[PDB]
Design a protein around this ligand. Structure first.
Ligand SMILES: [Ca+2]
Ligand SMILES: [Cl-]
Length: 260
């Protein structure tokens, strides 16, 4: 299919096309892109479907991959679908975009693709491969199923930790505080099953995504330009060794990718 992450273009050309006229909002958006442009020259427009946060994050992460992270090296990753689903039968309420075989296939694909990108000797080779992966075919959407599953797993771990009275990050308190997400099954039925289908990730879920793929997500939040949230980093205090991916969000809904 066609690319789902558009070829790059100059960031201020993009801004000039999108934000015309004299409103306060347009001016704030221009200021926001000007700030991004201090560090990045170009932007790739990410398909604005209900997977956009996952597509933006994963595209960035994979296109920058120079190694296979330990969490993807771990043999336990491939065993996780069987163990989780066997233990928590309610995971069978998973809405696809048996179940154990499907999720395992998706995780295997994620690992295989990531490992192949990491092996590549030129960054251009990596960009070519990574473009081909994000062409709106079954493989792309399989990656999202894997990432969603990792999000569920991390949420289960955090919930169980909280139950045992163990220290957890505060975002997880906020995640489970939502009346539609009080436990992992509610998270699955009311939030994760909707992702890619009827809605995208909420703020608190961007922290969950970051934890699930062990990447630090630095977001220019243009609707927050004249405030301290003009950039928000997910999580706030990650391990120093998590790679960093940078995104742009005009309105905390849709994410695009700055490049240099
Ligand atoms: Ca190129
Ligand atoms: Cl034009």
């Amino acid at each position: 299919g066609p690319l789902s992450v558009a070829p790059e273009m100059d960031i201020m050309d993009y801004c000039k096309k999108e934000w015309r006229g004299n409103t306060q909002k347009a001016t704030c958006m221009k200021m926001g892109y000007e700030e991004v442009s201090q560090k990045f020259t170009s932007i790739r427009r990410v398909r604005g479907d209900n997977y956009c946060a996952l597509r933006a994050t994963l595209f960035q992460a994979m296109s920058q991959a120079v190694g296979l992270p330990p969490w993807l090296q771990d043999p336990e990753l491939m065993l996780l679908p069987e163990k989780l689903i066997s233990k928590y039968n309610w995971i069978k309420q998973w809405k696809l975009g048996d179940l154990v075989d499907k999720i395992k296939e998706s995780l295997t694909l994620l690992r295989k693709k990531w490992a192949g990108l990491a092996e590549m000797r030129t960054a251009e080779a990596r960009q070519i491969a990574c473009d081909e992966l994000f062409t709106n075919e079954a493989e792309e959407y399989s990656l999202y199923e894997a990432v969603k599953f990792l999000m569920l797993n991390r949420a289960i771990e955090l919930y169980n930790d909280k139950e045992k009275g163990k220290e957890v990050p505060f975002f997880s308190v906020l995640l489970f505080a939502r009346d539609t997400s009080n436990d992992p099954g509610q998270l699955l039925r009311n939030h994760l099953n909707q992702v890619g289908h009827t809605g995208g990730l909420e703020q608190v879920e961007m922290f969950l995504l970051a934890y699930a793929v062990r990447h630090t997500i630095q977001v220019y939040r243009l609707s927050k330009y004249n405030t301290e949230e003009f950039i928000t980093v997910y999580p706030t205090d990650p391990p120093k060794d998590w790679p960093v991916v940078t995104l742009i969000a005009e309105a905390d809904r849709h994410y695009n990718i700055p490049v240099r």
